[PDB]
Write a protein that binds this ligand. Structure first.
Ligand code: 2CV
Ligand code: 2CV
Ligand code: 2CV
Ligand code: 2CV
Ligand code: BR
Ligand code: BR
Lengths: 90, 92, 90, 92
């Protein structure tokens, strides 16, 4: 659990660094600085408006943005759902 | 369960009190009274348009509103998911 | 499981009957007939756009509509999450 | 897990093939080719704007589209939730 939430903090920070670089200039409100990025990626992790709100408007400028976001979702969502069911049994 | 759902009820009322104060005058439709607040926070707990619908339009006036909402989400969401998985086992 | 999904079918049909009556005339696209109602309530059960999309536009005509929807959500969501974790162990 | 995720991959490809055919010409942005379809159906599996965003605008042209989408959701959502809860236990 302490390890799982260590992993996910690193994945979160690394993903927000990458996204700040990738989409910062084209999507300033969502990714213009690292703080805007950790927030948006938390939102994307909660699946809230991820495609209609974030990823489709992004794909109109970066057609392959799905290569970043979908695996990100798959990893954080699985890691969160592991952290939660971990803390419980623990 | 009985105690978990007591904790979550208190957290819920305290959060709705706090939010009524914090965002009530700037965001009356969502937080103008305690009843509007308990509803909106139930919605935020379900994750339904929490960011594009609530929190981003709020951060345009209160840039740190994320300090309230995100931990609220993390607490309730985890506590809810624990309450439900509790009830189930508690009948096994 | 067979019992749980019997309960939830009855709750679903009863809720869609009630909603067709309550919000049918004021909200025809969402509740104008029983079929429109079972669909909308499936959507509400998945939590998709439930408040910004359905319940808030409804509360502008029926202020207490939350008395119906919130318990409905609480019941179906708990029953679904019981049916799923049931089938698994079964 | 290895077999569950094989099943879900096949279901996913078959569904995206079917949807490309069914809704491709009426809804090109969402289903105009198999790649647009696999993406849109991943989104529908996450429940993200599935009804207000996808399925309701689709039912305005294909009134029975719900016969495809709802069972798709029920199948993938259940299978995904089974795959994840499988992996976890499979390492206990
Ligand atoms: C899992 C851990 C997730 C952690 C999430 C932390 C987010 C941090 C956000 C932050 O520090 N902000 C600055 C607050 O001063 C908010 C920014 O996102 C900001 O640039 C804008 O989004 C808004 O201010 C627009 O109104
Ligand atoms: C987990 C427990 C969550 C409990 C949630 C209780 C919500 C109570 C809402 C309520 O009592 N209202 C007043 C009913 O008279 C509705 C208000 O939220 C209202 O100000 C507006 O949202 C609408 O009327 C808009 O048209
Ligand atoms: C858990 C079980 C959930 C079952 C859900 C079943 C929904 C049945 C919907 C149905 O039979 N329709 C008629 C199809 O002919 C669709 C209606 O909802 C319709 O009145 C409109 O919504 C659209 O046609 C608008 O374009
Ligand atoms: C579970 C596995 C899910 C796999 C999902 C794969 C999606 C593949 C998407 C893809 O290959 N695209 C082409 C990239 O060149 C993107 C398309 O969906 C595209 O037609 C549009 O959506 C955007 O380009 C809009 O601007
Ligand atoms: Br809930
Ligand atoms: Br997923």
């Amino acid at each position: 659990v302490g390890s799982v939430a260590a992993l996910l903090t690193v994945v979160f920070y690394i993903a927000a660094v990458m996204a700040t670089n990738l989409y910062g200039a084209t999507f300033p409100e969502w990714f213009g600085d690292l703080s805007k990025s950790l927030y948006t990626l938390f939102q994307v992790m909660t699946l809230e408006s991820w495609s209609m709100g974030i990823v489709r408007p992004v794909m109109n400028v970066h057609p392959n943005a799905w290569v970043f976001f979908i695996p990100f979702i798959m990893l954080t969502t699985f890691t969160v759902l592991n952290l939660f069911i971990g803390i419980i049994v623990d």
